[PDB]
mmCIF file of C-alpha atoms and ligand atoms in Angstrom:
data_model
loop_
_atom_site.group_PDB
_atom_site.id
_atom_site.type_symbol
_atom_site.label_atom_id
_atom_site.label_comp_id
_atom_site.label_asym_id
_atom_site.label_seq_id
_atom_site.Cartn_x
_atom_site.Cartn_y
_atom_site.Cartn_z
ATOM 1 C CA UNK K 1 0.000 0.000 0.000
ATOM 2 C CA UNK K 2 1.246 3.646 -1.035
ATOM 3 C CA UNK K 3 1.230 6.133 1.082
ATOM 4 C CA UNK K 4 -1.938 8.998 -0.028
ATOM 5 C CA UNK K 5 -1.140 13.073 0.480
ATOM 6 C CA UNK K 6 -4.257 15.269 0.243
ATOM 7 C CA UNK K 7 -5.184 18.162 -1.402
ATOM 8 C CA UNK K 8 -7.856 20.542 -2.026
ATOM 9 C CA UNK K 9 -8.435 21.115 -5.597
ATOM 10 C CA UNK K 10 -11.898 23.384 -6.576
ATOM 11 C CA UNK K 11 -13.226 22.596 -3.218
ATOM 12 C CA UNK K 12 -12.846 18.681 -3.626
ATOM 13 C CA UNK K 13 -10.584 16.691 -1.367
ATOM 14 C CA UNK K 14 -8.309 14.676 -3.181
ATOM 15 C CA UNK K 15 -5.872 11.688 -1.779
ATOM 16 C CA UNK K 16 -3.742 10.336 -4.155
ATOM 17 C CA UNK K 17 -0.357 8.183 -3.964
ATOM 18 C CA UNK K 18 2.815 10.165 -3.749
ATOM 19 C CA UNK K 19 3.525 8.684 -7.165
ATOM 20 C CA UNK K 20 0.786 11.015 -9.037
ATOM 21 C CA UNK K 21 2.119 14.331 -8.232
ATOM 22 C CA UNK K 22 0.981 18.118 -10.095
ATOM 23 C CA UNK K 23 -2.473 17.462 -9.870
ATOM 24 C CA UNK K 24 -4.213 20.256 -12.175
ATOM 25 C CA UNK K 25 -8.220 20.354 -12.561
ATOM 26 C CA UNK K 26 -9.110 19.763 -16.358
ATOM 27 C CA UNK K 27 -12.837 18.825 -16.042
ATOM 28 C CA UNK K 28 -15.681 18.582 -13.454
ATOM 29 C CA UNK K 29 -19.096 17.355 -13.294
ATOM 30 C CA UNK K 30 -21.976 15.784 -11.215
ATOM 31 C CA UNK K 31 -20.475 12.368 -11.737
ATOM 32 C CA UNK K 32 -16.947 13.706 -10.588
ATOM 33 C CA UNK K 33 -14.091 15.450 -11.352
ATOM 34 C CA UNK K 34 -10.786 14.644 -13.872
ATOM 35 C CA UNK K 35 -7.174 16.374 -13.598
ATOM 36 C CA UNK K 36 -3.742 15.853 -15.185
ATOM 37 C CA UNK K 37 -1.092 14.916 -13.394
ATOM 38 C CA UNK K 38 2.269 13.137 -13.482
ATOM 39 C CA UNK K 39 2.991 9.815 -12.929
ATOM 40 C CA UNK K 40 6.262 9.481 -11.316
ATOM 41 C CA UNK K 41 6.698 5.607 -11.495
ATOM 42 C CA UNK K 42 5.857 5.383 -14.635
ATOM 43 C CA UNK K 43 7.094 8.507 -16.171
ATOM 44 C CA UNK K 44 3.451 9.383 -17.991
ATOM 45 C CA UNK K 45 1.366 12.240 -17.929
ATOM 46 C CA UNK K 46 -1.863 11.300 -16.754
ATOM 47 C CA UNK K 47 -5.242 11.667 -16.055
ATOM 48 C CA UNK K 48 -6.970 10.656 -12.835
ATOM 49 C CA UNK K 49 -10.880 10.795 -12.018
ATOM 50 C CA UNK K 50 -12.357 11.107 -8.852
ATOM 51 C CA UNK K 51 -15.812 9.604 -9.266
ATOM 52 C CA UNK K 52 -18.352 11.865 -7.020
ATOM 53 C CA UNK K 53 -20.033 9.790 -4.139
ATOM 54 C CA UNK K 54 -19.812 6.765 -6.331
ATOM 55 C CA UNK K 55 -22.671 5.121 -3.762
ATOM 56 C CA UNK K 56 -24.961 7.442 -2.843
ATOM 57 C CA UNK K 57 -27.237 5.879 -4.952
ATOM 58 C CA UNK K 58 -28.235 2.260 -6.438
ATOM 59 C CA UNK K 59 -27.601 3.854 -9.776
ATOM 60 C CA UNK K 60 -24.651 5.182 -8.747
ATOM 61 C CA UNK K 61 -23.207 2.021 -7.306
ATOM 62 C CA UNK K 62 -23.944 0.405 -10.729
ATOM 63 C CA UNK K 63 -22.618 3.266 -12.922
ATOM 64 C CA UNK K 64 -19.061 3.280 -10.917
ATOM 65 C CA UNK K 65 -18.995 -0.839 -11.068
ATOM 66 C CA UNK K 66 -20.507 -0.805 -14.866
ATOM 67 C CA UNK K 67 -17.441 1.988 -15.800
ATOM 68 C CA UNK K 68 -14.392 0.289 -13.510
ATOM 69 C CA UNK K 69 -15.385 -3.011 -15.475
ATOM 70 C CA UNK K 70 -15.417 -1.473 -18.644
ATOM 71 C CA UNK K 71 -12.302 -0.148 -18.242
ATOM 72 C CA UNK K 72 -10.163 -3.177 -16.668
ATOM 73 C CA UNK K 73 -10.921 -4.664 -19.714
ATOM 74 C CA UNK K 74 -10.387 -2.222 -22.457
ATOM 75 C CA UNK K 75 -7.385 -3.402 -23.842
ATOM 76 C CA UNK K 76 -6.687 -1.899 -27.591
ATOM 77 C CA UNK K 77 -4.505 0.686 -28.682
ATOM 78 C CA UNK K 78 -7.766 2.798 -30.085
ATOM 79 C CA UNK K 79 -9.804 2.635 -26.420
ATOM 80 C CA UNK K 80 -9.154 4.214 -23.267
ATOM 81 C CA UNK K 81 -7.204 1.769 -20.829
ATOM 82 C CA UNK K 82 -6.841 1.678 -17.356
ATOM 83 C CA UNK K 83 -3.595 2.709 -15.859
ATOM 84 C CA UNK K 84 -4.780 1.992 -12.555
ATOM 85 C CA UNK K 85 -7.279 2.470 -10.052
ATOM 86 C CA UNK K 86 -7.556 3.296 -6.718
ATOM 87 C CA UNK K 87 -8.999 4.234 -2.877
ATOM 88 C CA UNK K 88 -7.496 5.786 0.467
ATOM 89 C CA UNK K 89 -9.462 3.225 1.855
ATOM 90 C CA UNK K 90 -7.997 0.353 4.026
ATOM 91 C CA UNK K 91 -10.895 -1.940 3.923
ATOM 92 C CA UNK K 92 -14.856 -2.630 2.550
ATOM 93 C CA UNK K 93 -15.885 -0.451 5.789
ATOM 94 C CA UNK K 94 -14.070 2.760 4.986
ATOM 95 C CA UNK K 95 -14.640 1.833 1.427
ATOM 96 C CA UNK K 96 -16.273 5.162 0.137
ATOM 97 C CA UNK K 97 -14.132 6.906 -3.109
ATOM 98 C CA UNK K 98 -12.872 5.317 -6.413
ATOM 99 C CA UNK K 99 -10.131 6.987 -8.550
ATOM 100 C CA UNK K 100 -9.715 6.195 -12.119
ATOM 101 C CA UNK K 101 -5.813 6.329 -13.790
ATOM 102 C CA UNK K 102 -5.888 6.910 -17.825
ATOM 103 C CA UNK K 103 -2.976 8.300 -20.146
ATOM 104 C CA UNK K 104 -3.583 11.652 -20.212
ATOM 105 C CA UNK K 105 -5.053 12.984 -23.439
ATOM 106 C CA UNK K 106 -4.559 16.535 -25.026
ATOM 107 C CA UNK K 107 -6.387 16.969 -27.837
ATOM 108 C CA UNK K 108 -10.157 15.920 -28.396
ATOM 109 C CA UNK K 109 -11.312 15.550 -32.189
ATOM 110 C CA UNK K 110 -12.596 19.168 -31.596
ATOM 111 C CA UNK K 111 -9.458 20.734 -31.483
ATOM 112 C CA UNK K 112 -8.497 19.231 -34.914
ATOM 113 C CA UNK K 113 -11.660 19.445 -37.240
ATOM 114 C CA UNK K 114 -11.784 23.606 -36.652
ATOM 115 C CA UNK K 115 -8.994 25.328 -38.474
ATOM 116 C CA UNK K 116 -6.777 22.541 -38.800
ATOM 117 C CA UNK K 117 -6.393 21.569 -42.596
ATOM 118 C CA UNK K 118 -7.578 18.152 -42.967
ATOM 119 C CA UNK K 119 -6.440 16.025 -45.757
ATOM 120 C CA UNK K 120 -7.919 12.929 -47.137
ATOM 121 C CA UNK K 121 -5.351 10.278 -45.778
ATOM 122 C CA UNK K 122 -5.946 12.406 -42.087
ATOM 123 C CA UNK K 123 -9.521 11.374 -42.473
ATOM 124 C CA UNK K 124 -8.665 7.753 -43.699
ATOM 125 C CA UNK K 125 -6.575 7.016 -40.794
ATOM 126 C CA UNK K 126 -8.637 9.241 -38.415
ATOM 127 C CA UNK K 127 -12.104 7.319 -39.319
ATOM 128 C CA UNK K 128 -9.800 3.837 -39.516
ATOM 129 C CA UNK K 129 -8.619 4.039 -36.035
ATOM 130 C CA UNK K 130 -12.306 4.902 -34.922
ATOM 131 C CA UNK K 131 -13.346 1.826 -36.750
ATOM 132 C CA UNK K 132 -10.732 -0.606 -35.471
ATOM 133 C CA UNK K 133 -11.238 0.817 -31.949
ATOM 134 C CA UNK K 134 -15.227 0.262 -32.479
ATOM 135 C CA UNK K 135 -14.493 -2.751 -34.092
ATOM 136 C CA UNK K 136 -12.833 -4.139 -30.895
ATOM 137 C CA UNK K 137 -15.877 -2.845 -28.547
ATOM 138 C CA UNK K 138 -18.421 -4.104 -30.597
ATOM 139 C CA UNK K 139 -16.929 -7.971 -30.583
ATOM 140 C CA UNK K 140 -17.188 -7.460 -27.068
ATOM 141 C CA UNK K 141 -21.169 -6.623 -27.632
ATOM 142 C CA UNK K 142 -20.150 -3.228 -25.944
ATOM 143 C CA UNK K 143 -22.198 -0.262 -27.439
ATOM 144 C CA UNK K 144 -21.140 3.020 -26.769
ATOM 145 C CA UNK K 145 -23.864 4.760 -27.391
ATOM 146 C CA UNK K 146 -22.195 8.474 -27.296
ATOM 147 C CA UNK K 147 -19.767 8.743 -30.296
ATOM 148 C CA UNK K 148 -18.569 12.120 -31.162
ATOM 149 C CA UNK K 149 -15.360 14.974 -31.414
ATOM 150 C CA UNK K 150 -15.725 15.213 -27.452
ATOM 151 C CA UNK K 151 -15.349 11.699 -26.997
ATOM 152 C CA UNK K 152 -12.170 11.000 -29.161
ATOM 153 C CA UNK K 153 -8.408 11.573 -28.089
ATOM 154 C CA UNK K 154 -6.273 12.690 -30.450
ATOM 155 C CA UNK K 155 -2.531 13.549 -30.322
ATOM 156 C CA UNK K 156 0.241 15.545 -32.765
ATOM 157 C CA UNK K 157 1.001 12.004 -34.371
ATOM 158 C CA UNK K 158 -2.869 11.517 -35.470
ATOM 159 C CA UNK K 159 -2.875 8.945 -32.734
ATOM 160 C CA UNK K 160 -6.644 8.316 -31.534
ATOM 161 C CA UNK K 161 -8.409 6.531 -28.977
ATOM 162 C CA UNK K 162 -12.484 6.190 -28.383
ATOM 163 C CA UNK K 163 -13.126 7.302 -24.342
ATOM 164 C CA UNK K 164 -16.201 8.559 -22.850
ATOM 165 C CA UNK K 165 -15.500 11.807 -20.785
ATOM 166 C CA UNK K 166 -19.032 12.534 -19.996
ATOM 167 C CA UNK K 167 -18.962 13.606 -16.301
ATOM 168 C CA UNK K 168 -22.581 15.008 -16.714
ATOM 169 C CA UNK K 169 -25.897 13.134 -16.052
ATOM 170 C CA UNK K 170 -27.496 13.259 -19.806
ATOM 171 C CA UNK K 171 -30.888 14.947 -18.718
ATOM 172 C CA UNK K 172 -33.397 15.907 -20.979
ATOM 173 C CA UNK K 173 -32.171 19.950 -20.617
ATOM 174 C CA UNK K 174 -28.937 18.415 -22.022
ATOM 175 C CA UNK K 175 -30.535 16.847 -25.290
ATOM 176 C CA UNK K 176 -32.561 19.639 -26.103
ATOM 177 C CA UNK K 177 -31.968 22.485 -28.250
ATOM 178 C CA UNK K 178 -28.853 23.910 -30.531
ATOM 179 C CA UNK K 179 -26.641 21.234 -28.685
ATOM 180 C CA UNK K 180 -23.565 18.822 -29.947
ATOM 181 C CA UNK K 181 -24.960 16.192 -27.239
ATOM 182 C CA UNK K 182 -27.282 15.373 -29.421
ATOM 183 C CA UNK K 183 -25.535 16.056 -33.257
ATOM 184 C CA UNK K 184 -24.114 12.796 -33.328
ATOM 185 C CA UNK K 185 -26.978 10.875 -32.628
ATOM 186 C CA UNK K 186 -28.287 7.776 -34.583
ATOM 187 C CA UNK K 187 -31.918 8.519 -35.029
ATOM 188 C CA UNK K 188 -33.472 5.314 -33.691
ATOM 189 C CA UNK K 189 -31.888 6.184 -29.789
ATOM 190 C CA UNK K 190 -32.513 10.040 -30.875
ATOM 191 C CA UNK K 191 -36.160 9.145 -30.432
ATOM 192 C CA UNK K 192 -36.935 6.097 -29.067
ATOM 193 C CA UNK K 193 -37.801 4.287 -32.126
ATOM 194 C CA UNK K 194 -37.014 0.616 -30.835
ATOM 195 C CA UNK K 195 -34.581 -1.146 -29.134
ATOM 196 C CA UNK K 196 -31.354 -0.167 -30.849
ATOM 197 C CA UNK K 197 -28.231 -1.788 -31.206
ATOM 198 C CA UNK K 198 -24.352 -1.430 -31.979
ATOM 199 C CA UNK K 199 -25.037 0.540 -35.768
ATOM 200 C CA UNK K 200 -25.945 3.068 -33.371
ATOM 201 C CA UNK K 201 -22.503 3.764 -33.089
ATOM 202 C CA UNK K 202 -21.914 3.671 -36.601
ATOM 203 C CA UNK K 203 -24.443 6.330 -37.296
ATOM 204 C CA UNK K 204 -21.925 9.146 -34.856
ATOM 205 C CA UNK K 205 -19.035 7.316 -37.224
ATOM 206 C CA UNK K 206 -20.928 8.944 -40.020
ATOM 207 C CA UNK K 207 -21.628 12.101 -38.622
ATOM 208 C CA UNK K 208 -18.533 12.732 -37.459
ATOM 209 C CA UNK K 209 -16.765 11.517 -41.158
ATOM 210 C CA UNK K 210 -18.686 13.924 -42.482
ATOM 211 C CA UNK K 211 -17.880 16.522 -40.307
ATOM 212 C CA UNK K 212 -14.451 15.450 -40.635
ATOM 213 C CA UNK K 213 -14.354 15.570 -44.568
ATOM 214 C CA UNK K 214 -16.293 19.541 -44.190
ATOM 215 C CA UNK K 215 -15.113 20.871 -41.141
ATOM 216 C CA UNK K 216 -18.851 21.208 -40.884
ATOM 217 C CA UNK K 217 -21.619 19.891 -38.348
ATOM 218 C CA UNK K 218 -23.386 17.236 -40.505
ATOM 219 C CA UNK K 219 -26.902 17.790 -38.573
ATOM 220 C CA UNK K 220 -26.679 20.369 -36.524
ATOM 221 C CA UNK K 221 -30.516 20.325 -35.477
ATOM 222 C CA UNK K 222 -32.211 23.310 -33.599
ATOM 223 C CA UNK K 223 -34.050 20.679 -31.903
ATOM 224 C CA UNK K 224 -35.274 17.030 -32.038
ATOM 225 C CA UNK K 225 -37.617 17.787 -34.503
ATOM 226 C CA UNK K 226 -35.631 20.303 -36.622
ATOM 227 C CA UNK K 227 -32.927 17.614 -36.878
ATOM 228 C CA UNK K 228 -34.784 14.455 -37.584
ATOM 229 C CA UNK K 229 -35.700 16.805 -40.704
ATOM 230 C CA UNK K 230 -31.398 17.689 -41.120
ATOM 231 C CA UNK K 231 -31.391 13.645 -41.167
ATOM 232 C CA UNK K 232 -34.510 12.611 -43.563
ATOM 233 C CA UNK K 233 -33.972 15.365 -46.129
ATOM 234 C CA UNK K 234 -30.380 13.571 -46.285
ATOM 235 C CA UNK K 235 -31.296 10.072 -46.313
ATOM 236 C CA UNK K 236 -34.633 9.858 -47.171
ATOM 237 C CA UNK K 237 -37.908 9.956 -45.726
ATOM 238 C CA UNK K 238 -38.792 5.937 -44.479
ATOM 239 C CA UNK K 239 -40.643 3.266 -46.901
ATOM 240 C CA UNK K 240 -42.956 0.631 -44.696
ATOM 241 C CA UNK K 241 -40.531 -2.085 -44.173
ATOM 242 C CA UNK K 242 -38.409 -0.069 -42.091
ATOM 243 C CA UNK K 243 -41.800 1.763 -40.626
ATOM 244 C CA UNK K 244 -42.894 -1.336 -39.296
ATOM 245 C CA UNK K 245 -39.521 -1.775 -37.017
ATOM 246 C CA UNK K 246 -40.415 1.576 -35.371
ATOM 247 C CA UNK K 247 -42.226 0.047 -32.353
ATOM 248 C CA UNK K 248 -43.368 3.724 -31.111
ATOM 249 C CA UNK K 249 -46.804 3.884 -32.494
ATOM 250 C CA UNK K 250 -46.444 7.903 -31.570
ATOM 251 C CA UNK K 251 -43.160 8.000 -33.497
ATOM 252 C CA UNK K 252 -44.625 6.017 -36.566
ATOM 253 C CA UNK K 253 -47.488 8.259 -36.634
ATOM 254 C CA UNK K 254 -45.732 11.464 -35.832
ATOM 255 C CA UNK K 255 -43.197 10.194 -39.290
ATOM 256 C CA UNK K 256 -45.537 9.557 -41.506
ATOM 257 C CA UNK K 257 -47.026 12.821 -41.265
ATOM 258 C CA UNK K 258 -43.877 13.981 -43.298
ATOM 259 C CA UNK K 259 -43.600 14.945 -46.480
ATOM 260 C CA UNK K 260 -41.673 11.862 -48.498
ATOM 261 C CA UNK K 261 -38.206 12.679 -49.611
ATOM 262 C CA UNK K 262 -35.936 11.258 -51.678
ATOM 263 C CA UNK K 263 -31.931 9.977 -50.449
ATOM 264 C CA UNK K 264 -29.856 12.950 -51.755
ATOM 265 C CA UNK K 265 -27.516 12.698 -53.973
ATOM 266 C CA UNK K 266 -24.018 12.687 -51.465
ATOM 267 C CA UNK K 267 -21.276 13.278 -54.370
ATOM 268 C CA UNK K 268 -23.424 16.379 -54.532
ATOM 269 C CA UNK K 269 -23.548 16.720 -50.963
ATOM 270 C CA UNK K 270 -20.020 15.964 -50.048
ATOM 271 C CA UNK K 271 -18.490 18.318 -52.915
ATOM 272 C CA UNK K 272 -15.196 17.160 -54.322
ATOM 273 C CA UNK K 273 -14.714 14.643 -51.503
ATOM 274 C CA UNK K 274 -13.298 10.894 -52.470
ATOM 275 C CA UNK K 275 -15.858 8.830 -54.068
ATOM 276 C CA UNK K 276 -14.343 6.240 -51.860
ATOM 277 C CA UNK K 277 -14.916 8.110 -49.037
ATOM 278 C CA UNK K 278 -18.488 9.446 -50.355
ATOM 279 C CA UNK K 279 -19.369 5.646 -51.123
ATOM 280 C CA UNK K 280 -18.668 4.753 -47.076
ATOM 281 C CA UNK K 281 -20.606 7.333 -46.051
ATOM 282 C CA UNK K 282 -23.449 6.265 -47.794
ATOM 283 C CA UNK K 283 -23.612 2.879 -45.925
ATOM 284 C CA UNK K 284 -22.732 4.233 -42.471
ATOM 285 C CA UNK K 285 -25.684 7.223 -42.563
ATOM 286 C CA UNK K 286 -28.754 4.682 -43.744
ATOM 287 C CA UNK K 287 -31.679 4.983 -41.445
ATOM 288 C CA UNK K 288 -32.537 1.306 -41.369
ATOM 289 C CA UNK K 289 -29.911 0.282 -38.605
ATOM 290 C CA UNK K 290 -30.578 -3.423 -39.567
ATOM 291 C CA UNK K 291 -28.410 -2.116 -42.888
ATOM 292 C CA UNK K 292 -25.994 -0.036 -42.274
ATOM 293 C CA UNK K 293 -22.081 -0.962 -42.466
ATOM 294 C CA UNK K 294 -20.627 -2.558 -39.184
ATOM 295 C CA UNK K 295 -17.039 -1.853 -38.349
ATOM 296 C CA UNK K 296 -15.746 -5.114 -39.224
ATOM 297 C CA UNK K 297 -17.156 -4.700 -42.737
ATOM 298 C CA UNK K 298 -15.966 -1.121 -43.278
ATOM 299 C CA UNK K 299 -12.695 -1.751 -42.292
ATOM 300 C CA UNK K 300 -12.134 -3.552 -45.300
ATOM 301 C CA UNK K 301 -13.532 -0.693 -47.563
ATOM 302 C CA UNK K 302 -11.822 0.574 -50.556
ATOM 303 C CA UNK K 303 -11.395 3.865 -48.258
ATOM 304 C CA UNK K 304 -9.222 2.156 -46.086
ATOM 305 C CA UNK K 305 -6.869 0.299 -48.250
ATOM 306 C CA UNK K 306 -3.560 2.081 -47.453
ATOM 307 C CA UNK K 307 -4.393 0.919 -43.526
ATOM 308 C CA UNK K 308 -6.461 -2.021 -43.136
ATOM 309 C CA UNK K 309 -4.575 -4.932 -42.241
ATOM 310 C CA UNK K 310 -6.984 -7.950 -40.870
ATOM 311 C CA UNK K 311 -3.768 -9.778 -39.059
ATOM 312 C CA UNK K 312 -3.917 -6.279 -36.945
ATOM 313 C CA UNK K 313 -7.434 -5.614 -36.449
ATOM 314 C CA UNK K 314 -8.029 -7.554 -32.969
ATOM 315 C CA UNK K 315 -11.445 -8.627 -31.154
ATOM 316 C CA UNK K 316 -11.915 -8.337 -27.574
ATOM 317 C CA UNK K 317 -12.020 -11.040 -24.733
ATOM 318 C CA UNK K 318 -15.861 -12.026 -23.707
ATOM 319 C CA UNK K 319 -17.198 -9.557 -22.320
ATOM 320 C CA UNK K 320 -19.501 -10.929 -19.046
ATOM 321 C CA UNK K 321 -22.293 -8.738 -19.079
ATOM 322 C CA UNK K 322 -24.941 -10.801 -16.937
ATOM 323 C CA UNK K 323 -24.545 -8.041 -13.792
ATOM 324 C CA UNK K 324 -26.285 -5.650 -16.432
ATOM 325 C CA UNK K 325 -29.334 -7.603 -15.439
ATOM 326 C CA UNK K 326 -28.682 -8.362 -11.797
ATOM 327 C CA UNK K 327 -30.831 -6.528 -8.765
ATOM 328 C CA UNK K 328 -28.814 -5.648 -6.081
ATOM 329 C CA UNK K 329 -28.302 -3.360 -2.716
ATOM 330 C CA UNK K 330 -25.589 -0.572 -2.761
ATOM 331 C CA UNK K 331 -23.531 -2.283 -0.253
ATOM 332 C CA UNK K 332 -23.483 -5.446 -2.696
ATOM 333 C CA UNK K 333 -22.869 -3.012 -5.723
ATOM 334 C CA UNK K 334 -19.816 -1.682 -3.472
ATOM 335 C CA UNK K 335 -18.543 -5.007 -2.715
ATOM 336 C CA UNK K 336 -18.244 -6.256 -6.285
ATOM 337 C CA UNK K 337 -16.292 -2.744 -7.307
ATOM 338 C CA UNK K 338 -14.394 -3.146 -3.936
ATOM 339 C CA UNK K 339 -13.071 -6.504 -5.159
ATOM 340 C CA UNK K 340 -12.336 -5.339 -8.767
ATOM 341 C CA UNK K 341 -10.531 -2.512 -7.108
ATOM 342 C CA UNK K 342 -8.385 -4.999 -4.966
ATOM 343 C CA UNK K 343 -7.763 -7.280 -7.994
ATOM 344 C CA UNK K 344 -6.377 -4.783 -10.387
ATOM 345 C CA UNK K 345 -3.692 -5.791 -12.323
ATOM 346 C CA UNK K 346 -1.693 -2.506 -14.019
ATOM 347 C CA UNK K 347 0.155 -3.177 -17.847
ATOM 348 C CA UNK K 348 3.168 -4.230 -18.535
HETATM 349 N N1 LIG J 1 -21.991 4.275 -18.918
HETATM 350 C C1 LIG J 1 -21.968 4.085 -17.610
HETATM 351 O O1 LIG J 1 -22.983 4.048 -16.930
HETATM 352 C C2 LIG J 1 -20.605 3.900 -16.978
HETATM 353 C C3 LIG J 1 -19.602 4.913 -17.499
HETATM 354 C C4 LIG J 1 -19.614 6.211 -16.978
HETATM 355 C C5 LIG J 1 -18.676 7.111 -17.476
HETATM 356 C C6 LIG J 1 -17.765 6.702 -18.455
HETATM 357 C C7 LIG J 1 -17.707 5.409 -19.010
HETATM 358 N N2 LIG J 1 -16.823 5.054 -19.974
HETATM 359 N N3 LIG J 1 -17.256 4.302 -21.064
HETATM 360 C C8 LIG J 1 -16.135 4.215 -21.812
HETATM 361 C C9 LIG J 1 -16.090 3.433 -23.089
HETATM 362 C C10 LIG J 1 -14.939 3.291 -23.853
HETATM 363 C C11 LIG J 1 -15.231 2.511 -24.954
HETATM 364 C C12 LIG J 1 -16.553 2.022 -25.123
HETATM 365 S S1 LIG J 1 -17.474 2.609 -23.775
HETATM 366 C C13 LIG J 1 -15.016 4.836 -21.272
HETATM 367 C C14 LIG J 1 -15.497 5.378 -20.078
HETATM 368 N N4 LIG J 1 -14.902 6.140 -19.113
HETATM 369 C C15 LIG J 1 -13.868 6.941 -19.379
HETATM 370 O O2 LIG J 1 -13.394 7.036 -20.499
HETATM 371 N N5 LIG J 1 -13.361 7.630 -18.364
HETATM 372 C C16 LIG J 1 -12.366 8.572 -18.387
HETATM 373 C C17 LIG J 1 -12.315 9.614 -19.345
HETATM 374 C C18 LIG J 1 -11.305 10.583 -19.287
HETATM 375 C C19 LIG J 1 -10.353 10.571 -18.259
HETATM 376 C C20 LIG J 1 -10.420 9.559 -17.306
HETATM 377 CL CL1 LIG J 1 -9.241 9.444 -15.960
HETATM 378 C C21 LIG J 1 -11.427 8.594 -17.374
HETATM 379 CL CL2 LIG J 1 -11.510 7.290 -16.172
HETATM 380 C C22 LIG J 1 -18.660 4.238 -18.265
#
C-alpha cells in the first residue's frame, strides 16, 4: 500500500499516492471530477478521475462498477485503458471513493476538425482508427452509445483513442436544443424508435466523417424535430418495411405525417470529396440500422486500403455482461467494485 497526500483542488478533497504528483483540474461534473497529473513511477502524464459519491445511490453504485469493469478490460490501442485504479481506503468499511488512472489525453477531435487543414489520408486514418477501436468494442457486444469529437483523443502524431469523458448526467435539458450532445446521434436512440443496437454507433461514425471531410456539423438540429428533418432530407424519408420496425406507435405516426423525400444525392452533398470516401458514407448514414455498415465490414472498404490490415485488427475477450441484469443493494454493488478494485492488475 502507497502512502496517499491530500489536497484541495476546486473545493474537492483529493488523496492520491505520492507517485501522481501536479495534480491540475481539467474537467468537473456531477459524476466527478478529472485532472492531469504526473505519474512518477511510470514517467506518464496522466489523467486521474475522482468519481463523485460513487454510492450514494443504487444507480450510482452500478454506474461506478458498470465503468471500472469497462475499463479493466479495455485493452486496444484505439480505447481508453486503465492505468490503474484506486482508494485511500484500508478496507470494505471505509470503502467510500474510487479513482480512475488513464494516459492523459490533449487533444479531443474538436481541437483538430476547426482550423486545422484536414487532408484525405488524415480522415482515412482518423475514421480507420475509430473503426478498429469500435471494431474491438463491438466484438465485445459493448455499445457506446455516445460517439462524437468530445469523446475521441487525439494527439500531434494523429494517434486516436475512443473514451467517454461525460462527467454530466445526460438529462433531458442536455438533449434539447442547438446542442452537440445530441448532433451525433443515430436517429433510432434520438427518439426512441425501438430497441437499438451497436449501428448506433456507426451512425456518430458517419456524422462525425462527415464533419471530418467539411469541417462542418453534418446535422446540426435546432431541436429534435428540426434535426430528424437535417437527417430525412439527407437520407430519405422511411418506406414501410423499415416503418414497421419503429415500435413507437407515436413515433410512426408522428413520421408519416412527413412529407416523403428522396436519399440525396451525397457526391453532390459531399463536394469534391473521395468517391471512396463518399461511397462509405453512404452505408454508415442509412436509417434502417438493420443495414448499415458494421465496423468489421468497413474496415475492409476501398477507403481504407492504405491501412487495413486484418492480421492487426483484434477482437476483444468475452465480455460478461450478466450483472447488467442483476438486482442488487448498494452495499453489494460496493462489494463487487471493492473486489475489482483490490484485484487490479496494471500493464506491462
Ligand atoms: N456508462 C456508464 O454508466 C458507466 C460509465 C460512466 C462514465 C464513463 C464510461 N466510460 N465508457 C467508456 C467506453 C470506452 C469505450 C466504449 S465505452 C469509457 C469510459 N470512461 C472513461 O473514459 N473515463 C475517463 C475519461 C477521461 C479521463 C479519465 Cl481518468 C477517465 Cl476514467 C462508463
Amino acid at each position: 500500500r502507497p502512502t496517499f497526500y491530500r489536497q484541495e483542488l476546486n473545493k474537492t478533497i483529493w488523496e492520491v499516492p505520492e507517485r501522481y504528483q501536479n495534480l491540475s483540474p481539467v474537467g468537473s461534473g456531477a459524476y466527478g471530477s478529472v485532472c492531469a497529473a504526473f505519474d512518477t513511477k511510470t514517467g506518464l502524464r496522466v489523467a486521474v478521475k475522482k468519481l463523485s459519491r460513487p454510492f450514494q445511490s443504487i444507480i450510482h453504485a452500478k454506474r461506478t462498477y458498470r465503468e471500472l469493469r469497462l475499463l479493466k478490460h479495455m485493452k486496444h490501442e484505439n480505447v481508453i485503458g486503465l492505468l490503474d485504479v484506486f482508494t485511500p481506503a484500508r478496507s470494505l468499511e471505509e470503502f467510500n471513493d474510487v479513482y480512475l488512472v488513464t494516459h492523459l489525453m490533449g487533444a479531443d477531435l474538436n481541437n483538430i476538425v476547426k482550423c486545422q487543414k484536414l487532408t484525405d489520408d488524415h480522415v482515412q486514418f482518423l475514421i480507420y482508427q475509430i473503426l478498429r477501436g469500435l471494431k474491438y468494442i463491438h466484438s465485445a457486444d459493448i455499445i457506446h452509445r455516445d460517439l462524437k469529437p468530445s469523446n475521441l483523443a487525439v494527439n500531434e502524431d494523429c494517434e486516436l483513442k475512443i473514451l467517454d469523458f461525460g462527467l454530466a448526467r445526460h438529462t433531458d435539458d442536455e438533449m434539447t436544443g442547438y446542442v452537440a450532445t445530441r448532433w451525433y446521434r443515430a436517429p433510432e436512440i434520438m427518439l426512441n424508435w425501438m430497441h437499438y443496437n451497436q449501428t448506433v454507433d456507426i451512425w456518430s461514425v458517419g456524422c462525425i466523417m462527415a464533419e471530418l471531410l467539411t469541417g462542418r456539423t453534418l446535422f446540426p438540429g435546432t431541436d429534435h424535430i428540426d434535426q430528424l428533418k437535417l437527417i430525412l432530407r439527407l437520407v430519405g424519408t422511411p418506406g414501410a418495411e423499415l416503418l414497421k420496425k419503429i415500435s413507437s406507435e407515436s413515433a410512426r405516426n408522428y413520421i408519416q405525417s412527413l412529407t416523403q423525400m428522396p436519399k440525396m444525392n451525397f457526391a453532390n452533398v459531399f463536394i469534391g470529396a473521395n468517391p471512396l470516401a463518399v461511397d462509405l458514407l453512404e452505408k454508415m448514414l442509412v436509417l434502417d440500422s438493420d443495414k448499415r455498415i458494421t465496423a468489421a465490414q468497413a474496415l475492409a472498404h476501398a477507403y481504407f486500403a492504405q491501412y487495413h490490415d486484418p492480421d492487426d485488427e483484434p477482437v476483444a475477450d468475452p465480455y460478461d455482461q450478466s450483472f447488467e441484469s442483476r438486482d442488487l443493494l448498494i452495499d453489494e454493488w460496493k462489494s463487487l467494485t471493492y473486489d475489482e478494485v483490490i484485484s487490479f492488475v496494471p500493464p506491462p
